[PDB]
Amino acid sequence: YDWRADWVKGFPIDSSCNATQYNQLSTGLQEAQLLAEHARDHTLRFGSKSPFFRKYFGNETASAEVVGHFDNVVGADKSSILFLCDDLDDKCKNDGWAGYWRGSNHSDQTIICDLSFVTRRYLTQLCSSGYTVSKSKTNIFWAGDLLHRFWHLKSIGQLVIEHYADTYEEVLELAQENSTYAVRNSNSLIYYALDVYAYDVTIPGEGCNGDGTSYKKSDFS
Amino acid sequence: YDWRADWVKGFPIDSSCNATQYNQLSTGLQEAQLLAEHARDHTLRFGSKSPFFRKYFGNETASAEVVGHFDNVVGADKSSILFLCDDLDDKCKNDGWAGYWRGSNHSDQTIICDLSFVTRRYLTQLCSSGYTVSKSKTNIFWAGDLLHRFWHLKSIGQLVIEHYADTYEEVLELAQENSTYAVRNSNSLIYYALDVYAYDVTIPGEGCNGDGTSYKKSDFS
Amino acid sequence: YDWRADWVKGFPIDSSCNATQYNQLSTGLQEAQLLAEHARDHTLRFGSKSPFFRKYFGNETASAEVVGHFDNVVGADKSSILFLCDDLDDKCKNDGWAGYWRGSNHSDQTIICDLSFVTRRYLTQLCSSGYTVSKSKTNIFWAGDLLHRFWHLKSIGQLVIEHYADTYEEVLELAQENSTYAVRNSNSLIYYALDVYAYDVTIPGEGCNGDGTSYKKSDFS
Amino acid sequence: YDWRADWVKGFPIDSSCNATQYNQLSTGLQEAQLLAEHARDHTLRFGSKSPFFRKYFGNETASAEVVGHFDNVVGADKSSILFLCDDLDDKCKNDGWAGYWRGSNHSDQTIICDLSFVTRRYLTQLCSSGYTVSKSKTNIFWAGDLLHRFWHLKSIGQLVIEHYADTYEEVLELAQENSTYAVRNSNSLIYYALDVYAYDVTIPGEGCNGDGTSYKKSDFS
Amino acid sequence: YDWRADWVKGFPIDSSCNATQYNQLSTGLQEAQLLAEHARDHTLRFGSKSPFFRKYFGNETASAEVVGHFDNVVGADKSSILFLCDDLDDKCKNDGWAGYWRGSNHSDQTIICDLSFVTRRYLTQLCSSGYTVSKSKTNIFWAGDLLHRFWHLKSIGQLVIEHYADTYEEVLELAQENSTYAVRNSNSLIYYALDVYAYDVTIPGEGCNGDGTSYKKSDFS
Amino acid sequence: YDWRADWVKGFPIDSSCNATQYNQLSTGLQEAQLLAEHARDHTLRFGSKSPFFRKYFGNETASAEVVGHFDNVVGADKSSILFLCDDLDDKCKNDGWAGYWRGSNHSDQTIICDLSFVTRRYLTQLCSSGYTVSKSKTNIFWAGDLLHRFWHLKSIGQLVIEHYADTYEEVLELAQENSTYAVRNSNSLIYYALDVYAYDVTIPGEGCNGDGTSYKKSDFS
Ligand SMILES: [Zn+2]
Ligand SMILES: [Zn+2]
Ligand SMILES: [Zn+2]
Ligand SMILES: [Zn+2]
Ligand SMILES: [Zn+2]
Ligand SMILES: [Zn+2]
């Protein structure tokens, strides 16, 4: 049994999407996977010697679960997962909804409404038009919005990633008060990934956190 | 700060070892890293759908820490680890000692005695001369002996992997009774890695566990 | 004298633009070059045997100048060209201006205003949100807007490409009336490139021209 | 319709030629294509900044048609072109005829007589045995002789390349007098290609023009 | 007849060997081929300018047959050679036998006994545990033992390599006295290969000959 | 001492040769090495199983010296060899002299006269214009003319290759009469190389020997 020949590592898309919807959805999925890969590489390189890891997960926390989560996002068998462009449950009618998870009956399926193809942004425009990591919402860009959808699936989240803290202040408090549940909080991982990508790639050496902190090379040792 | 050009992913060796000792220690370390990489790949491909994972870690356990540990072994900054061939603590004189960890004063240093160069075997001789995974000691080969030494280092183990169960039957009981602690047990990881390597590479489809179990393709779904 | 070593094929950007502006300007310039390369490949493969060429340039026109223009855009010495973000001529104050050519005193220089970083789209969103090649403006996307700016530079356009027809109907009439002058017309070239890219890549086999014409494989021979 | 998998970029040869004629004809065609490619690259790098372009095409002529002709020779669909080794019109009986074009009834076919396999040289012998570009005939080598045959075919010449000036002095006059017609003159392109190849590859920095001119690095700026 | 598509340069193994026997036999054969390749490269690089060649083959001997032997080992066609783990002659009961050549009736077949899978060592352990090239037997390692069995095969030895000198002193005397038969002597080639490999790879600059001779870079000129 | 970093495998040329002389001589030197490599590959693939080997070296002759001779030409240190275009010994004045060996005082040097640049042919014209291997002279082409010069050098020939037979009939008699000196005869090797190249590449399956022999696939077994 050569299981290396059936290994699917990309997110499948259903046939309910036409050409133009497919073109943008695939690009968004690729950008989300790229963000996850960069986060995993940063974690492997530094660990708890990084101020970002220290402030999002704890001062003396072990980095194995974070690496495992990001590596599961990057490479794993995505054969039961399907992304659809069809409103089967009749829920896109609500005001301000760009998609939803199908629920427990179909725990590996998710729906994308038409607002996503009008409001979501791409990674080349990060930290522009007044955007900051700590003051704006996390679903403005394709990558941070699809990372949130991934955590709800059964093959990726595995029924351990939940919503323990949502605001930036609550996330900072949970980092230092409860480090056991900080590594499985939904918003902490997204904040960490966005911050490290902005610091390493977009504006090298500065980032765009926007809360009054600046980190140098002496903070990494 | 380009930290991608400052990244060290191999285990350094001190100059106390001459050419002959270096030649064999390097090969042993490479074999240990290869075993860790294959274990990571098997975990990422299957998770809790494979019978080996179910029998060593639990029927419905999440595979994040297991991936993280082997990924830390494969890729991480080994800039503070050192392997020495010099008896700095006068402990190779004991009976049957092939090495020791230097302890809390030097948490990233290991010493190798002369017995290892005459007793340790190589991966091409697996499942031969009457060896079985479950009935023989885990330190007969270089890879399984060095995996156990990796778990004591501060940069790899991070003070969470310990000895909760050592015997095969105790490991089997821990897998089903206390699943939270059977992801940070030293012997469970080594048994899992040795069992999944021999089933996939050494004797494809059969393995050499030698306890009375046979698994087919229908058990992986 | 090895002139293959100091051969610059990309478009230089001045230091007046900060990191955020640079990130988007580079992507726009690369997309324009990619569009020109695809147009060149289509022209070389077919010539006057394709309906797009016949309806934009003439039924029996020779395809040499058309190939040469796109080849000059793709590969040539861009050593005297500079793109700036400073308003050195005090012209961005005008309503609806996204940039301007510096003129005959500085024939290889051009200025980009801030409206560009707010209204320009990317190639992954082509033929969406009601966009139509025949009915919309040619400067909605980054690539079509920068191709028009390329024709004004001294080293690319070489003082032969002008404005002979601007609307779609005028271009269509010029194709059949004056074939000698509809090979150095800016709008003709931009329309041709956008049409062939939309037909070949975005919606394979259909395109998004939106004028009531549909071409099959039998029209290419 | 994937037209990139149906693209033919080499010149086909009929089955009339035996094993020995094919071997030499293929090498001749390859050398002609290589010469065209080098001429295209020199034009793309320099334009009207090189003295060779200035002396063959005009002091301030635009380089788009010149690039397009050589690019058409290098890469284009050669699917209806055929080279034959069989006398079908009974014309090889003439004195000094090494081949001919089949005419308007068969606009994409050429015939090669037996003198070609006796009196044609290779690119490794350029500028030797007293040969000069200005004082010798242009059909002495395979590469310069097949380029002249390419201009007569319908899929490459496209009925725009003609004989307006044959001798070297008339070629030099046409460049300064009528630059509109000295871009579609058969002999100007061949002289240009041979001169730039000899200057760049055969004898770097000197060439073998044999006219009385010596160009330095300061002439290219 | 394209004979490049059916060219076999590896030694085939019969299906009478199970998985564990196959795994070790393949590694041994590969190591033997690697040793032969290194010997060929050393001979080509130096010839009679190296002290090892001088001391094993003669002070003024020509090096063509020595190169040809190792090249035949590395890259001749091996489609009629077979290695078997089946005792078809009842010769395993002889004390101390690890294998035997099948004889003149089957001149291209060899049998491997079970004693070989317990005693033979690997190239990573060369010059260790008190081993010296001059004083130990040549069949201690897989490569040296398997090289001696190739000289008996009809496709490799070709009925010209024999046993003229067996001990080290007789080999050293044959090198200086009878140079015409030193290039056809079985033990001389193995001694030469082991010496050059130990000097070049295992202990760079010193080797492990163990007879009191040390060579520097000035002896190679 | 890393001797793989200063390994020279091409034939050096002196500064006494101008640009055109260098251009022609380097190509001539490369063609001979290509021919030698093909001859070595044919010998390794077949040995005495091919009818070309049997007719030039003997029915049951071993093939190691032939392989070594061609391998020394293909890959070996050539740092003491030099080719010159200056007539230092005053010998480029006799009728029909295209070069000469400098003799025992300078045994690694060769002079090339001016007839070589006028008379020698290239491998693309093999078996044409009435050429046959057995009825024409050996030195008509660059490759066969330079293979004869290689055998006189001290670093390649090594004072064992001589002139024992010159005509085709004598060469054929020597193979069956005296097989020990046929493998070190200058003309036998060149005849064998030319024959196998013409049979394998120039006219696949037929060759151009021109003596009334035809070999099929059944002859190679
Ligand atoms: Zn959620
Ligand atoms: Zn322990
Ligand atoms: Zn304009
Ligand atoms: Zn003509
Ligand atoms: Zn023997
Ligand atoms: Zn001679």
What separation in Å is there between the alpha carbon of B94 and the centre of ligand 2? 17
Query: Which long-range contacts (C-beta less than 8 Å, at least 24 apart) are formed by A100-106?
Result: A101/A149, A101/A152, A101/A153
Q: Check D24 against F125: CB less than 8 A apart.
A: yes
Give a three-class secondary structure readout of chain B.
Answer: CCCCCCCCCCCCECCCCCHHHHHHHHHHHHHHHHHHHHHHHHHHHHHHHCHHHHHHHCCCCCCCHHHHHHHHHHCCCCCCCEEECCCCCCCCCCCCCCEEECCCCCCCEEEECCCHHHHCECHHHCCCCCCCCCCCCCCCEHHHHHHHHHCCCCCCCCCCCECCCCCHHHHHHHHHHCCCCCCCEHHHHHHHHHHHHHHHHHCCCCCCCCCCCCCCHHHHC
Distance CA C161, CA C183 (A): 8
Tokens of E14: 């019969």
> Which parts of chain F fold into alpha helices (H)?
19-46, 51-57, 65-74, 116-119, 142-150, 168-177, 179-182, 186-197
Asked whether the CA dihedral C187, C188, C193, C194 is positive or negative, the reply is positive
D144: nearest Cα among D195, D110, D180: D195
Closest chain E residue to F158 measured between Cα atoms? E62
Order of strands across the sheet that contains E99-101: E82-84, E109-112, E99-101
Beta strands B109-112 and B82-84 are parallel
Facing C64 at nearest CB: one of D68, D77, D205:
D68
Cα D127 to Cα D31, D203, F29, F84, distances in angstroms: 16, 9, 20, 21
Beta strands B109-112 and B99-101 are antiparallel
Q: What residues in F contact E71, CB-CB < 8 Å?
A: 44, 67-68, 71
- The CATH number assigned to the domain with range B34-76+119-220 reads 3.40.390
Closest listed ligand to the CA of F147? 6
* Residue owning tokens 């080509």: E44
- Is CATH 3.40.390.10 what the domain over C19-202 is classified as, yes or no? yes
- Closest-CA distance, E120 to chain B, in angstroms, reads 12
Distance CA D146, CA D142 (A): 6
Interrupted after residues, chain D (C–N over 2.5 Å): none
Tokens of B136: 């023989």
What separation in Å is there between the alpha carbon of E151 and the centre of ligand 5? 8
Helix (H, G, I), strand (E, B) or coil at C80: coil
Distance CA D45, CA C155 (A): 11
Facing A217 at nearest CB: one of B1, B76, B77:
B1
- Is CATH 3.40.50.2300 what the domain over D3-204 is classified as, yes or no? no
Neighbours of chain B (3+ CB pairs under 8 A): A, E
Architecture (CATH level 2) of domain A19-204: 3-Layer(aba) Sandwich (3.40)
How many helices and strands (H and E) does chain D possess? 6, 3
CB distance B48 to B60 below 8 Å:
yes
Q: What is the largest distance, in Å, between two alpha-carbon atoms of chain A?
A: 55
Q: Left (φ > 0), alpha (ψ -120 to 50) or beta: where does F22 sit?
A: alpha
CB distance C84 to C112 below 8 Å:
yes
Neighbouring C-alpha atoms within 13 Å toward the C-beta of F79: 8
The residue type of E176 is: Q
Tokens of D18: 């035996």
CB distance F1 to E205 below 8 Å:
yes
Rg (chain F; Cα; Å): 18
CB distance C44 to C67 below 8 Å:
yes
Q: Check E20 against B122: CB less than 8 A apart.
A: no
Distance CA F52, CA E63 (A): 25
- What's CA A128's distance to the chain center, in Å? 19
Q: Check A128 against C19: CB less than 8 A apart.
A: no
> Which parts of D103-167 fold into alpha helices (H)?
142-150
Which experimental method was this entry solved with?
cryo-EM
E110: nearest Cα among E18, E21, E12: E12
The partner residues of E111 in beta bridges, in order of sequence, read E84, E100
Chains D and C touch (3+ CB pairs under 8 A): yes
CB distance F65 to E65 below 8 Å:
yes
Task: Kindly provide the resolution of this structure in angstroms, with one decimal.
Answer: 2.5
What separation in Å is there between the alpha carbon of C49 and the centre of ligand 3? 30
Tokens of B210: 């030698």
Helix (H, G, I), strand (E, B) or coil at A99: strand
Closest chain A residue to B159 measured between Cα atoms? A62
Chain D residues contacting F, CB < 8 Å?
19-20, 23-24, 27, 117-118, 122, 124-129, 202-203
Closest chain D residue to C49 measured between Cα atoms? D155
Chains B and A touch (3+ CB pairs under 8 A): yes
What separation in Å is there between the alpha carbon of D149 and the centre of ligand 4? 7
Domain boundaries, chain C: 19-202
Closest chain C residue to A126 measured between Cα atoms? C20
Beta strands E99-101 and B82-84 are unpaired
CB distance F119 to D129 below 8 Å:
no
What separation in Å is there between the alpha carbon of C150 and the centre of ligand 3? 10
What separation in Å is there between the alpha carbon of B101 and the centre of ligand 2? 9
CB distance E117 to E24 below 8 Å:
yes
Interrupted after residues, chain B (C–N over 2.5 Å): none
What separation in Å is there between the alpha carbon of C25 and the centre of ligand 5? 75
The partner residues of A13 in beta bridges, in order of sequence, read A83
Facing F122 at nearest CB: one of D19, D122, D129:
D122
Cα F149 to Cα A146, C71, F32, F212, distances in angstroms: 72, 50, 11, 30
CB–CB contacts below 8 A, A to C: 36
Closest listed ligand to the CA of D101? 4
List Cβ neighbours of B85 (8 Å cut-off, separation of 6 or more).
Answer: B14, B16, B17, B21, B25, B111, B112
List Cβ neighbours of A104 (8 Å cut-off, separation of 6 or more).
Answer: none
List Cβ neighbours of D101 (8 Å cut-off, separation of 6 or more).
Answer: D109, D110, D149, D152, D153
CB distance F49 to F221 below 8 Å:
yes
Pick the CATH number of E19-203 from 1.10.10.10, 1.20.120.140, 3.40.390.10, 3.30.230.10: 3.40.390.10
The partner residues of D101 in beta bridges, in order of sequence, read D110
Q: Check A62 against B217: CB less than 8 A apart.
A: no
CB distance D186 to D161 below 8 Å:
yes
Torsion of CA D135, D139, D140, D143, to 10 degrees: 120
Distance CA D17, CA D25 (A): 9
Closest listed ligand to the CA of F110? 6
Distance CA E143, CA E120 (A): 9
Distance CA E125, CA B123 (A): 15
CB distance B84 to B110 below 8 Å:
yes
In our burial notation (b when 16+ CB lie closer than 10 A, e otherwise), range E123-156 reads bebbbbeebebbeeebbbbbbbbbbbbbbbbebb
Distance CA C212, CA C206 (A): 11
Tokens of D155: 């899929």
Proportion of chain A in helix, strand, coil states, percent, rounded to 5: 45, 5, 50
What separation in Å is there between the alpha carbon of F100 and the centre of ligand 6? 9
Closest listed ligand to the CA of C149? 3
For chain E, the residue count is 221
